[PDB]
Amino acid sequence: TESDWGKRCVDKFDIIGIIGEGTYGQVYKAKDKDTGELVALKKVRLDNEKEGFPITAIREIKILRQLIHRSVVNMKEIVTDKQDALDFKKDKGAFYLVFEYMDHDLMGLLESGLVHFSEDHIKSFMKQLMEGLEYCHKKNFLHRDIKCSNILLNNSGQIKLADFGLARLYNSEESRPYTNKVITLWYRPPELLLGEERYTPAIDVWSCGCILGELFTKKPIFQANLELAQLELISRLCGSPCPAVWPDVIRLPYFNTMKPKKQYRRRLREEFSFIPSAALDLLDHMLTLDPSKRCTAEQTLQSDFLKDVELSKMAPPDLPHWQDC
Amino acid sequence: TKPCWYWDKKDLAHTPSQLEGLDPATEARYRREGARFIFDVGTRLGLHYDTLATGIIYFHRFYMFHSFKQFPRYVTGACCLFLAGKVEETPKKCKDIIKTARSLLNDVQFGQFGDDPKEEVMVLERILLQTIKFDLQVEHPYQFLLKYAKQLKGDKNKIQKLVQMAWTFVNDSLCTTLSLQWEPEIIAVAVMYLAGRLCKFEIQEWTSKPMYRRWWEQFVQDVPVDVLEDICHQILDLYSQGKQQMPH
Amino acid sequence: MSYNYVVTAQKPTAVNGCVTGHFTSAEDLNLLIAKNTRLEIYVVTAEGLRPVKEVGMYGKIAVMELFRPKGESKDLLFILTAKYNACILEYKQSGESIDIITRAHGNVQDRIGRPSETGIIGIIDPECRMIGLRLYDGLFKVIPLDRDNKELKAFNIRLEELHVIDVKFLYGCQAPTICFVYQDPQGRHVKTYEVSLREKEFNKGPWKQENVEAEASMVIAVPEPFGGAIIIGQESITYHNGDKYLAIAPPIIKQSTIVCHNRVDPNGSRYLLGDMEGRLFMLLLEKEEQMDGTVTLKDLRVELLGETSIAECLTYLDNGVVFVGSRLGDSQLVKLNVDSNEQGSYVVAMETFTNLGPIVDMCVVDLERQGQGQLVTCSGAFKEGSLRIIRNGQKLHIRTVPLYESPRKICYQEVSQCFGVLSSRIEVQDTSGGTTALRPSASTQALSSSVSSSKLFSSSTAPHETSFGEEVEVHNLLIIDQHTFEVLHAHQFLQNEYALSLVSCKLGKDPNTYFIVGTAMVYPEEAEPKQGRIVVFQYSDGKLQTVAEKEVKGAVYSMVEFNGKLLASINSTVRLYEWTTEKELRTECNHYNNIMALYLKTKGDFILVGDLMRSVLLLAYKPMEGNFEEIARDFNPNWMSAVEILDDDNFLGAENAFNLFVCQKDSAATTDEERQHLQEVGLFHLGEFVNVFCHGSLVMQNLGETSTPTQGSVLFGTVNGMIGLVTSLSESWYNLLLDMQNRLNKVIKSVGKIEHSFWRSFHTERKTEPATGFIDGDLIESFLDISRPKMQEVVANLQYDDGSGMKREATADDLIKVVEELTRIH
Numbered sequence A: 001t002e003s004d005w006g007k008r009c010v011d012k013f014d015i016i017g018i019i020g021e022g023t024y025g026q027v028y029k030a031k032d033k034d035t036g037e038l039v040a041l042k043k044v045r046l047d048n049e050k051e052g053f054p055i056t057a058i059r060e061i062k063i064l065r066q067l068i069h070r071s072v073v074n075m076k077e078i079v080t081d082k083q084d085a086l087d088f089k090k091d092k093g094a095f096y097l098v099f100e101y102m103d104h105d106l107m108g109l110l111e112s113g114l115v116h117f118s119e120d121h122i123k124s125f126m127k128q129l130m131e132g133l134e135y136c137h138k139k140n141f142l143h144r145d146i147k148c149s150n151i152l153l154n155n156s157g158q159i160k161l162a163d164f165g166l167a168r169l170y171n172s173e174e175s176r177p178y179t180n181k182v183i184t185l186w187y188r189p190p191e192l193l194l195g196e197e198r199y200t201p202a203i204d205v206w207s208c209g210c211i212l213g214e215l216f217t218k219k220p221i222f223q224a225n226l227e228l229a230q231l232e233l234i235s236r237l238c239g240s241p242c243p244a245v246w247p248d249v250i251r252l253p254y255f256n257t258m259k260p261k262k263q264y265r266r267r268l269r270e271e272f273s274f275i276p277s278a279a280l281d282l283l284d285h286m287l288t289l290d291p292s293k294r295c296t297a298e299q300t301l302q303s304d305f306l307k308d309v310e311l312s313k314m315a316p317p318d319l320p321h322w323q324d325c
Numbered sequence B: 001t002k003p004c005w006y007w008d009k010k011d012l013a014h015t016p017s018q019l020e021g022l023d024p025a026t027e028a029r030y031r032r033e034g035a036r037f038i039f040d041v042g043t044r045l046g047l048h049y050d051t052l053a054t055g056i057i058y059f060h061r062f063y064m065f066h067s068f069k070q071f072p073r074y075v076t077g078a079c080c081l082f083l084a085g086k087v088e089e090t091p092k093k094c095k096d097i098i099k100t101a102r103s104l105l106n107d108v109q110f111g112q113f114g115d116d117p118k119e120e121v122m123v124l125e126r127i128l129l130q131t132i133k134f135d136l137q138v139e140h141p142y143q144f145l146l147k148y149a150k151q152l153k154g155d156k157n158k159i160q161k162l163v164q165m166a167w168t169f170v171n172d173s174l175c176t177t178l179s180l181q182w183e184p185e186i187i188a189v190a191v192m193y194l195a196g197r198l199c200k201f202e203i204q205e206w207t208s209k210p211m212y213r214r215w216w217e218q219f220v221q222d223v224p225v226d227v228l229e230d231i232c233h234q235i236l237d238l239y240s241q242g243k244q245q246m247p248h
Numbered sequence C: 001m002s003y004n005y006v007v008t009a010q011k012p013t014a015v016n017g018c019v020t021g022h023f024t025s026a027e028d029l030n031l032l033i034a035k036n037t038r039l040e041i042y043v044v045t046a047e048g049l050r051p052v053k054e055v056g057m058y059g060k061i062a063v064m065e066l067f068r069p070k071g072e073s074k075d076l077l078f079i080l081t082a083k084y085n086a087c088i089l090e091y092k093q094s095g096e097s098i099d100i101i102t103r104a105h106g107n108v109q110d111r112i113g114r115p116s117e118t119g120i121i122g123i124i125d126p127e128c129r130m131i132g133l134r135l136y137d138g139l140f141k142v143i144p145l146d147r148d149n150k151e152l153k154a155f156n157i158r159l160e161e162l163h164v165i166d167v168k169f170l171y172g173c174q175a176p177t178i179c180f181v182y183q184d185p186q187g188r189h190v191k192t193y194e195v196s197l198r199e200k201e202f203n204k205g206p207w208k209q210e211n212v213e214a215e216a217s218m219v220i221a222v223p224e225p226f227g228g229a230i231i232i233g234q235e236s237i238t239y240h241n242g243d244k245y246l247a248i249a250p251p252i253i254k255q256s257t258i259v260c261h262n263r264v265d266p267n268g269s270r271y272l273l274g275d276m277e278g279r280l281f282m283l284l285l286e287k288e289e290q291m292d293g294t295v296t297l298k299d300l301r302v303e304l305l306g307e308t309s310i311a312e313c314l315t316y317l318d319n320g321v322v323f324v325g326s327r328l329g330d331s332q333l334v335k336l337n338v339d340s341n342e343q344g345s346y347v348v349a350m351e352t353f354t355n356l357g358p359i360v361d362m363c364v365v366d367l368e369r370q371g372q373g374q375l376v377t378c379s380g381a382f383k384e385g386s387l388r389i390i391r392n393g394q395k396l397h398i399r400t401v402p403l404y405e406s407p408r409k410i411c412y413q414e415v416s417q418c419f420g421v422l423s424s425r426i427e428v429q430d431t432s433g434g435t436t437a438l439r440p441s442a443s444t445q446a447l448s449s450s451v452s453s454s455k456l457f458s459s460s461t462a463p464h465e466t467s468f469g470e471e472v473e474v475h476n477l478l479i480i481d482q483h484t485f486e487v488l489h490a491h492q493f494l495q496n497e498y499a500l501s502l503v504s505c506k507l508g509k510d511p512n513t514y515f516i517v518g519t520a521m522v523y524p525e526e527a528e529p530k531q532g533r534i535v536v537f538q539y540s541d542g543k544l545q546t547v548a549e550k551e552v553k554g555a556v557y558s559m560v561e562f563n564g565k566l567l568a569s570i571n572s573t574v575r576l577y578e579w580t581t582e583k584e585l586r587t588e589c590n591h592y593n594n595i596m597a598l599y600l601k602t603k604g605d606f607i608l609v610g611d612l613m614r615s616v617l618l619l620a621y622k623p624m625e626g627n628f629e630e631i632a633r634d635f636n637p638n639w640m641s642a643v644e645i646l647d648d649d650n651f652l653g654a655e656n657a658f659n660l661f662v663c664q665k666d667s668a669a670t671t672d673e674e675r676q677h678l679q680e681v682g683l684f685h686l687g688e689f690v691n692v693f694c695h696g697s698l699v700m701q702n703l704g705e706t707s708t709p710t711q712g713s714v715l716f717g718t719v720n721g722m723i724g725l726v727t728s729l730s731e732s733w734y735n736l737l738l739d740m741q742n743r744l745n746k747v748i749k750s751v752g753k754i755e756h757s758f759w760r761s762f763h764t765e766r767k768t769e770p771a772t773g774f775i776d777g778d779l780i781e782s783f784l785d786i787s788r789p790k791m792q793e794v795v796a797n798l799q800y801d802d803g804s805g806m807k808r809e810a811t812a813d814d815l816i817k818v819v820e821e822l823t824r825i826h
C-alpha cells in the first residue's frame, strides 16, 4: 500500500541534479519514472554509524507525517538504495526522504535581486506563511529555524515552509529546558540572543516579522556576525531591552551581560515610514521585544493587512525571466 | 496514507514466531520479558514514561512482522528503546543502553548481544525503521487517562485513587498484546472502567452527564462494553497468573 | 584558495554625466565629464576643450554637481558614489602642481531603506543652503551646507509620495522648494513642498498639484526671470508656475522618447532637448513682458535642430558649441548654426570622441598573422552601433566600422576570410501593414541578401495584433569581410525571431565550415519563449546557404562546440547534438536541472553553465556512457552576466551587481558532498558590467619577451566600454602584491577619502564582503606614479617568500621593475 514506507527503491526516480547541500545529506531533484512527477530526495546517511539515523531527520519524518496544510511541505514517501540481500548487517545503503519539488527559494529569488514584491504579493505571501505557522502552532509545534532559505516559492505563488530539522513540540503548561541558540542569527528573536530557554512559539513570529520587513526593503533587517552586534542592531530599531518594555528581561541569563551601547528608543515606525500603514502595524507587533506582547500567528491573520486577503487570488511574484535575456 | 497498526486476537495465533514453532505461551513470555527489559533499562536511565512505552510499542509491532527465533528479543528491545529515545526527544547514547543492559541481564541473556553489543543494536535500527514503516508518532493510554480524568469533578481523593490504579493498569498492559488490538483511547477508558469496578466507584456521577450510565461514550464513541470487558479480563489475567494482586 | 590579478586595458569610454561651471578657477569655464569611476576636467577655449586634470575615484560616480556657496571664490564639486560615499571636492593648483582637495566626506547610507526605481537623484539648492538626495522610496535626505558639516551629516524627512520620478530644486522661492513628479495609482502628478532646515520637515508648497502626463519623466527648473518648472513627457511638454499652466504637444516629439535636457540661455529663454533617435531640439520660452513691470511666459515652442549621437547628457559650451555626452555611441562636439545648411540642419559635427559603447560581444583574432592578435568588438546600440578593431600598437589603435544597427554576437570564420555578426534593427508598424526602417543600415546595405523561408512555425493559429507606430526588432546574420569590413551578405530571420547565439565550426566528419545561429520566437505575450530554431548555414561563393534546421522548444541562449558536437542551451536545458552523415542535428544527451541556461563554456569534456540565479555548474560529458554528469555547483545564489573557465579547477563569473567571483572544486575527495561543492575562493567588486569573457591578449610577442609572473589571459568587455584582463598568480606572487596593496593604501591619498578596501568589497544590496583572491592591478600599477619618498615608504620592511632567500628585503627600484613587468600584460 501507499503507507508501507522504506521499501520502495530509489530506482523509481531519475535523478536530475543536486539542488542543495542539506544538513544530513544533499538534496537531489528527481523525476518519478512512473508518474513524471518532480520530487526532491533528501538523502539520509546512516552509514556513519556514530549514533544511527540522524535525529534531525527523525524530527522531519515524525512531524511532517502529522502536518497537512497547503503551506507546509509534504513528505510523499521514504525510499532506499538497493539493499543488500539476506545480510542486513552489511547493508550501509541510505534512505531518501521524498518531497514535492519547489521551483525557487525566497533567498534565491531575493539574492538574484530579480523579484519585486507589490503590497498585494506580500499579502498573498505572508497570509500563506502565517496561516501555515498557525497550523503548526495550533498543533503545538515550533519551527525554530524560520529563514529565507527555508521558505519555498513556486511560480504559481504557492508558499510552503520546509526545513523542520530543528522543530520540537511545545506544551505551555510545562516549561521545558530547550537549546537557546536555535534560530539563524539574522532571524533570531531577542530572547534567544539574551539566552532564553523554555522559549515561546513567538520566536517564530519574530523571524516572520524580519521577513515581512525584508520583503518591503529587499534587504535583511538585522545583519550581524556576532550575538552582541545583533542585539545592538535590534536595539537601534526596536529599543533596548529594558525593564519597562520587557518586565522579565531581568530574569534572562545575559541581560546584565549583553548591554547595548545605549538605552535606545524605539524608532521602528520612523525608519519604516515608507511601509503601508496596514503593514507597519503588523511589523511593529511582530517585532515586539517582549514575547508575551508579541502577537500570535492568529492575530496576524486577524489584522487589517492579512485578514481580507482572498487566498484564491494568489498573486505570482514579479519574476523577470526575460530581463537578463 | 497512514498504516493500520491493530490486529484481532485471533490473528496473533498466526504470528511468524508461532508459525516457526513457538508455542503461544512462550511467545507471550518472550513479549513480557522483552517489554519489561525495555521498561527496566529505561527506568534506570531516567527515561520519561512515554519514551518507555514508545519503545515497547515498536517492539510489540516488530514481532508481528518477524520471528523471535531469528531476531533476539533483548537486542530488539534495546534497539527499540534507542530509537524511541530519539523519536520522543529523550535521547540516549547506544553505549549507555548497552551498559545498562549488561547490569540487568545475565551472561546467557547478554549472549544474545554477541561479541559486539553496540553493533548488533545499531545494525538493527535499519530493519526496525522499515518494519514500523516509519510511523514513528505513537499515542499512549496515559494522555487519555489524564485528558478524561480532568473532566471528572468530585471527591479529589477518590478520583486520584482511580487515576493511579488505572495508571498502574496501563503500565501492566504494555507487557501484553493489547497495544496491538485496541487504540490507546480505548485502553485508557478500559483501565478507568476496571479501576472503578474494583473501587466500587460510579464514574458517571463525576461526568457532566451524571444520568448517562455508559460514561465512556462521551470520551470514546462506539465502544461496546464487550471490548472493555475483554481488555479488563486480559489485564487481570496477568495478576492471576503471577503472584501479584490488584493494587487497590 | 585561488590567486588572480585584474587589470584595466582600456578605461571606461562611456559618458555617464557632464556639467559646466567655474571649478578650476573663478575665471575659467570648465566641462567636467564623468565616466564610471573617472572624472575628466576640461577648460573651454576657442578650441573645443583643453584637458587639465583627470582623477580616479574608488566609487561609481552617481551624482556630480557644481555649487558656489557664499564666501567661495569658485565652484565646489559634489560627488556621491553608488555605494553612498559622499564628498565635496576643491581644485587647487600651485604652479605646475595640480591636486584635488577633499573638503568634506562621509557615507550617507541608511540602515533601513528601499532603493528607488528611478535611481539616486541629487540636487542642490539655488542658494546652496542644502543638498537633497533621493536615495530611498518614501524618504528625502538633506545634507545642510553649513561650514561645520565636514562629515556631511544628514537627516531624513518623511515623504508621503513613495514613487518619485524626478525632483529638482526650484528657483525664485522665499524658502527652498522641491518640485517633483510622482506616481500613485491615479496617474502621475507634479507637486511642490518646502524644506525647513530649522524644523527639519516639509511645509506646504508654493503652487498646487496638477495631474500630469502618465509618461512625464523630467523636471526642468526654469530660472528666476520666468520662474516655475517645465515637465517633459513623450507626447507633451508642460510648464507650471503658480496659477499659470502652459502645454505644448508638438507632433514631432511623440516619435522618439526624449532623454536629456540642458539650458542654452542663462535667463532660461532657450533649452536643449535630445531624444534616443539622435534628434536635438530647441525648447524656446517666448517672453511676454507686461506694462506692469512683469515678465511672463507667452507660449512654448519646439524647433528641430539636427542630428547628434544618442545622448545621455547634453552640456552647452559657450559659443554655439554643444557637448554630446553619449553612452550608446561616440561623444561629440557639435555646433549650432543660426543658418541651416542645404539639407535643413543647423548642427554640424566638430570633433568625435571614441566610445567603445556597450560591448555586447567580442572575439580575439590574428588578422595579419602577427601573433599579436586583434580584438573585434560588437559595440554601440541602435544608430550608433558599430564594430571596433582594437590592437595594442602607450595607446591602442582603434578602427571603427559603422553598422547603424545593433550588433549582438560576433564570431570569426577563418576558412571564409570573414566574420559573422548577429544584428538587430528597429522597424515601425506602418500603414501598409508591414514595417518600415527609420534609417538604412548594415542588414539593408548588404551586397547580397536572403530571407528565411522556414515553415517550422508557419502553422501558427496564434494571433498577434499590430498597432501602427509600434516598434519591432528585425534580426539578421551579417557576413563581413575581414579586410574591408564590407557587408558581403545579410540574412534576415523570421518575423519575431530573435538571434541569440552564434558559432563558426566544423561538425562530425563533415569537412564544411558552417555558421550556426540559435534563435527564439519572441512574442510579447510570453514570459519565457517556447519556440526556437538552430539553423546551420554555409557561407560559400558570396551566398549564404541554409544547410539544416532543428526546431527546439525554447530559446537557444548560448551555443558552443563540444569536440565535434553542438552544445546548446534551450532555456533550462543543456543539450549535446551530433552531426550525422545526413547533415542533420541529432540529440545525444540532455541536462535539465537549471532555471535558465544563459551561458555555456567548455574545456575538454568539461562544461561550465551559468544560470540566471543559480551561479555556475561544472558538468562533464562521460563518453563511455553518452550522457552528462553534475561535477559541482556554486550553491550561493548569484545573478550571472558572463562566465569563463580559467583552468581545469578555477572558474570565473561576473554578477549583475558589478562583482566578480572565482569558484574552485573543493579538491577534497573525503566526501562526495565536498566534491560537488564549488566554493567561491575569489570575490571582487569590479565596478563594471561584464558582458563577455574572452581568452586572448593583444600583447605583441616576438618571443624575446620573458614570461611575466602572471599566467593566463582572459579579456572582458563591459557596458561602460571598459576592457580588462584577468590573469592568475602563484601563491608567492599574490602575497607580495597583496601586502604591497595594504602598504600602498596607507600611502596613496584617495579622492573623497574613500577607503580602497571598502570600494573593492563584494557588494550586493543584501551582502557586503571583503575582497579575496584578487589583486587590484590598477592599484599596483600606480606605484610607478607616486613620489619617490612615498616609494621608499611603501617598500620599507617588505619581505619576499618561497624564493632563493626565504625572507628578502625589497628595494624601491626592485618593485619599479616588478610593476613595469606587470604593465606589459596589457
Ligand SMILES: CC[C@H](CO)Nc1nc(NCCCc2ccccc2)c2ncn(C(C)C)c2n1
Binding pocket: A017, A018, A019, A020, A027, A040, A041, A042, A073, A099, A100, A101, A102, A103, A104, A105, A108, A149, A150, A152, A162, A163, C593, C594, C595, C614
Ligand atoms: C530547504 C531549502 C534548500 C535550499 O534551497 N533545499 C531545497 N530546495 C528546494 N528547491 C530549491 C531549488 C533550487 C535550485 C533549482 C535549480 C537548480 C539548483 C537549485 C526544495 N524543494 C523541495 N525541498 C524539500 C526537500 C525541503 C527543497 N529543498
